[PDB]
Curated annotation (Swiss-Prot), chain D:
Its main location: cytoplasm. Residues 413-479 are annotated as: Sigma-70 factor domain-3. One of its GO terms (biological process) is DNA-templated transcription initiation. Residues 492-545 are annotated as: Sigma-70 factor domain-4. The gene is rpoD. Residues 518-537 bind DNA. This is RNA polymerase sigma factor RpoD. It holds the Pfam family Sigma70_ner. Gene3D superfamilies: RNA Polymerase Primary Sigma Factor, Sigma-70 factor, region 1.1, Winged helix-like DNA-binding domain superfamily/Winged helix DNA-binding domain. The keyword rRNA processing does not apply. InterPro entries: RNA_pol_sigma-70_dom (IPR014284), RNA_pol_sigma70 (IPR000943), RNA_pol_sigma70_r1_2 (IPR009042), RNA_pol_sigma70_r2 (IPR007627), RNA_pol_sigma70_r3 (IPR007624), RNA_pol_sigma70_r4 (IPR007630), RNA_pol_sigma_70_non-ess (IPR007631), RNA_pol_sigma_70_r1_1 (IPR007127). Transmembrane segments: none annotated.
Amino acid sequence: VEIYRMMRPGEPPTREAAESLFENLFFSEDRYDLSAVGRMKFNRSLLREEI
Amino acid sequence: RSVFPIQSYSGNSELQYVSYRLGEPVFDVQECQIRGVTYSAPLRVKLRLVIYEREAPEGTVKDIKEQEVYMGEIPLMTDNGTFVINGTERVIVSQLHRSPGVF
Amino acid sequence: GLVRVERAVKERLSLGDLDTLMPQDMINAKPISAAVKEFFGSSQLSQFMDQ
Amino acid sequence: QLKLLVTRGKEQGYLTYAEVNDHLPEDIVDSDQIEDIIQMINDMGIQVMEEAPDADDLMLAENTADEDAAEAAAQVLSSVESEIGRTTDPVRMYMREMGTVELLTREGEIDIAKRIEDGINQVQCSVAEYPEAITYLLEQYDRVEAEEARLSDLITGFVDPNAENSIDPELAREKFAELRAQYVVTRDTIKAKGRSHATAQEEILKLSEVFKQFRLVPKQFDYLVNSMRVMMDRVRTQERLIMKLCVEQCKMPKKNFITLFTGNETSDTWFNAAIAMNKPWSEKLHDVSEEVHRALQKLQQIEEETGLTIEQVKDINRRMSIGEAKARRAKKEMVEANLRLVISIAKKYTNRGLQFLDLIQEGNIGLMKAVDKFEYRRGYKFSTYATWWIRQAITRSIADQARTIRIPVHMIETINKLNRISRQMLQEMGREPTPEELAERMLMPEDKIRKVLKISMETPIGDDEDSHLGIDFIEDTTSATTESLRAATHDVLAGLTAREAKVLRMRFGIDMNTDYTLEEVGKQFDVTRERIRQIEAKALRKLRHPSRSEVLRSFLDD
Amino acid sequence: VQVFTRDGVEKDKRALEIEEMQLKQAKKDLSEELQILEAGLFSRIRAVLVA
């Protein structure tokens, strides 16, 4: 809800869209990708072992 | 492969896929200066649809339809590693960017 | 482009009795001609080559 | 934001003081303002706070209001609007403004339509009651049959009976004999026994019953209501002026006008009683009373204009506005009840079309014609009404509105028929578009389609298309060049052969202010005949030498 | 030098002479190519015979 405010000040925090507005920053059909190349760099800069 | 099959949010239809294609050109590099039109050819895509038993419990499927459709254009490239676009060799420069993920 | 512009297809896919309609019947054709022809001719990295 | 608190409080029929933080307006902070604004939260919602009841629930049933008609039920717009986010979009404020209506659909807006009709069809009962309005109603027709031989004029665009449209030409003519009979008695039997004294009230009531069928086109109806509004203000201007003169001339404020006027309105009788009162103000009237008779005699001269008395105006013209208070609450409330359906249709078309916003607000005006012509009396629903009319008001809002260019609408959206058809062309010929394919896809020749496409895209400089050659410009602002081509042709065609130099000026307007056939020209050629015409063309073959135009060609260029 | 139009209008005289300027080249070259081609292909058949 406070993240909905951070994109929509002075507008009602519509309960289910308050969750979508944040999770679709990183999990939407349109709004996030890395390729396998960027997931590799993500895991690499975190010293993971998950290939 | 990152968008299709669009099995619809409405739960009653699905716009399936199989693969892209390129084909059907008409201009060539000489006409792409003398006339001027960008050396290009149509992007066409293999698409499908499938629907299930509305009425019975022993066959699981009822309809299947599949074809091609248009979905855009693509410029074309020479042995010389060039392209011809509005009378001229307009050509993409490659980028050197921060690798995706986290920094 | 496949997740921002397909609106009339993504819309009207919900409504028809697709046992008797087809995987094509609302796909517009104008934009992905010029928008991919001229991705080599007016894009942010697609200058006239240094001939 | 606010809606959460007020809605859950009204659902509960009760709201505890501290629940202002359990269902908080996600807006503001005004904690010390609470101790008086709680007042209009309680006269229509009363509750307080203590440890625990045991048998004490009933309190609301002797202490609360009863209709939520227009008050904190709608003025709460300000208290839900008040925090629009200082830089962030019209596509936010409408979400606060629709903090009013939730979803009154499927019977609530039908009850708004029921309440339109106990408005309009009850205003009708006072059109039938104000004795000038039922006169001007028939004056509408008596203005036009009175000239011995007519068919149209104010006979047409009138009569207009929504008797659920169930009439014929003679039952339509009976509207000026049936109701005319009910009128011509009542019109003077309002003075028999008294204005509404015994049967005068029943006579008014039965005229007001037949006039329930006289439900009419919104502007033939509202002409009769505007007539009653204006004829009320013939008196209300006089009251408004004479009350002001009680202050300004007499020094007798507000309440003391009402104390004397409102029981003998008609004449300077009550003003002479206002002298008879004594007191220093009334005492001053003994040497200025003339200036008040010089105004109050034109309240009297309204009863003298009509055979009214203010005794009728006291109630009839208020009964009118008790009908209007329903009719035009409901023709506002019906628009309000549908403000969301306007978004869900309009926002389809707002898809970059011209802007993400403006088409919604034009739909909110298309909704006015829809609310005015809402024929629920066919049976159908406002959803379908919006899908037709309000959708095409949304379409036209950027079809020819807000463009550079605008045409008769068939010739607007036909340009878009071609763009709709192009969806085959770009994949069936399927590499580039070709008008040569569009010719089979339209079964028509390219140029009679280019009729539109030559000019309707953004208009070339075609002055008044080509007709600008023969229009109002034929004055010396053009014809001075004609009086130059004529001079140069008059030169050459007078150095040519002594016979041939006549002929080769005739038929189309070349040389004279009447460029005649034979009679006045043959008499100036002599000897022989229609060589008088053939030599207009003979020039093609021994005037062959192209130098023969060396002094003629400049008049495309001056 | 060139002239172009909406295709249903077959092309103007100054382009229709240049049609025969460009046609000359291919009309000649294809009459050389057919000979250059069979002078290889039938020379392979001729070689299989000479064996």
